[model samples]
Target: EPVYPDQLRLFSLGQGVCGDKYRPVNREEAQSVKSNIVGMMGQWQISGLANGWVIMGPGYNGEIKPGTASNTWCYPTNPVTGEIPTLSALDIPDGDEVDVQWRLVHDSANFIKPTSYLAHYLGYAWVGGNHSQYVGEDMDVTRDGDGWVIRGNNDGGCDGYRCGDKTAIKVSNFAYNLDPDSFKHGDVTQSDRQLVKTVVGWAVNDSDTPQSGYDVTLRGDTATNWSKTNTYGLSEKVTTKNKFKWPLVGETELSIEIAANQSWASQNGGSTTTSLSQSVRPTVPARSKIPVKIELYKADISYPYEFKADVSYDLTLSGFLRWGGNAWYTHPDNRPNWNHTFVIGPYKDKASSIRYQWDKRYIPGEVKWWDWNWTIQQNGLSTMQNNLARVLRPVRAGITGDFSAESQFAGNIEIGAPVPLLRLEIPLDAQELSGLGFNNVSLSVTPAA
Candidate 1:
């Protein structure tokens, strides 16, 4: 014997989880609620628990016969021969439209009269609707006689019921917002002469929902340009901009490419790109004065011989002119005066102003020389004269002396030719004149020419 609806009702006798709790509402309403539920699941929970059939009713309960022992229960099978009735899936109908009916009846008259009386009976129930935890309280179902009804659970669990397949998932709506673009051409005073056009912009979601795995790219007319691939989420602003500066100005076009991937990619299929364009031009200010120009040139005597040193003449004892009483007279044994000349520079006329400090050192031999007077000449003419013996002296070995021209030459200097600016003459000491030499002579010209 196959199990019938009567047998199924035996277990649902006391209501509650006694029978199938699955009740149908309008399919349209179901889908709408399902979509909203899925969105909420993605937002509030870690995984999408918004799938599966909805169960209604007060849950499960088991009851005893109307009048029986405290714990008496229904027999698992026919009490007469211990035969259990079973039904295969093939015995049930295919759809839910046709109502299948059955009932359970107990008879005590079978022992007395041939006619049996209905003692106790159980109402019909569906074997399919079992109590499933996945169909949480969010779904509301009620018994409308033999059939059941479904709706949003506003009556009891105000927030509604929780129902899902319990499969881990991440889902949401596909949308985005882009900010206004910007330009980077140049400043008001100069033209960078740049062919590349720079642009900047951003994208962000209107809600706090999270999304991931998006490919973003920035491009112009060329095949290869600037681009970026990354993930984005709700309320999290995704900043993007053009990496390649397009040189064309009049009507330059730019675009941002956002290719969705993963679950997000699956939802919003096809190309997702935004385009924009703007006019670009170089901004440069008007011309002004040439701005007083100045240039300076310096040379550090490329060759050492620019400065020359020599022992012009040796001081010797001979007849010399001496003032006696009132007149100048020559003495037979007195030594005649000897002179040493130092010549420097055929320098640029633009090098009119010049100065130099020379250091004189004596390498002692057996005797010592005493310095006397000296004269300075510029352009072969004497400009100044001074006494040297009073100001400087040559002593023993390792002794040094120094002198400088007090006057700074100032004049109109011609540019191309060099001038003979300095001529120095010193009266030499007759006694010890052998080991004489200038350790160094450093020259400098102002208004670098």
Candidate 2:
């Protein structure tokens, strides 16, 4: 018989004893709601049971700008219980704009994962209209225990029926709120001078002042300050307009001074200008591989905790971290977070070492996170988080510790030059936290270098 290899094929007859590999966990919504996305964003407590959605719509005749497309209605348990903080229509801050679309802050990945995961998506809109709405739907999930991607779609109930593609929720255009404590830039090249042209964006707060308004002014390296007539037509707020431009020839060395002042006439209203001096020699400086000792910190300042340990502690964790906060569980791609070890060793040996870790036991409950889009702050958006805030917060954490070795490394290395790393974990007092309306929540991290 020429059966040959074919003889074994009959014995290998496919379909083995199987139980439903995958049937709809439910006819409507899937049973699993504890998603990696929710875990990362600290909202896993909310369930995907009801195929949720948000409807920040206007009851009568008010302007209606919808939140981002990436919104997830919270479960009954996670909904705003009491009067948490609400941004009143008239008092939504000066530079702040009402976000009007769905957005998902995603980690760079090949694909998008579960759509029902609310933390992976959120929505907000400006206050042109009296009311706006956010809606979520299609509570379904597929378990890949090992990290998974995200996918989204609309349940189609109120107005139009829609389904998000396998594509992740994206933001081509959106408004970000800014504030004082968060003034560090996300990009190193984003000096005050560069922001003069594209000054159309929002600036939440500059200094620690509660009065929220931005002022732009031009100045020479030493003196000759000229304030720009910055103002927004739609919002009708006065801002330092970029009516003046600087010469590019010596732009780097020019002091493009810009300062902000509160509208209040009391505390000596004048230009709180910052020196925007740049010194770039035509010739490149000699190569120098400086060793930067980046240490982590929390409010503890003096003695920071340690991560990467086998032991655990009792604590409450909360607060805004640069790259990824609770969202670390969903997407940890290229995101720089609180690390236990800041030492960069060889590729092989480094992989075996635990860089950083966080535990809840040691946390003192009553933690709240507020990230500066590109700054280091405890609340609101003013600066960039990725570059300035992430690294700076750690430095501030270890302020009273041994952190003199940290500096920007000047080389072509990927993690090189003028690059500072920060690690922090501050404990809040129980009473103070309670006053601020926070509870069993904490954010802890040990310093490393």
Candidate with best TM-score: 2
- Model 1 residue 375 lDDT score: 14
| Deviation of model 1 at 214, angstroms | 42
Every candidate's CA RMSD: 60.4, 31.0
- lDDT per residue, candidate 1, 312-426, as tens digits? 1111111122222111112222323322111112222211111112111112231122210111211111111112211111111010111111111111111121112111122
True-vs-predicted CA distance for residue 405, candidate 1, Å:
74
Cα-based lDDT at residue 300, candidate 1: 11
> TM-score of model 2 relative to the true fold?
0.16
TM-score (all chains, Cα) for each model? 0.11, 0.16
Model 1 per-residue lDDT at 446: 17
Model 2: worst 10 consecutive residues (lDDT sum): 395-404
- Tell me the whole-model lDDT of each prediction, alpha carbons only: 0.19, 0.21
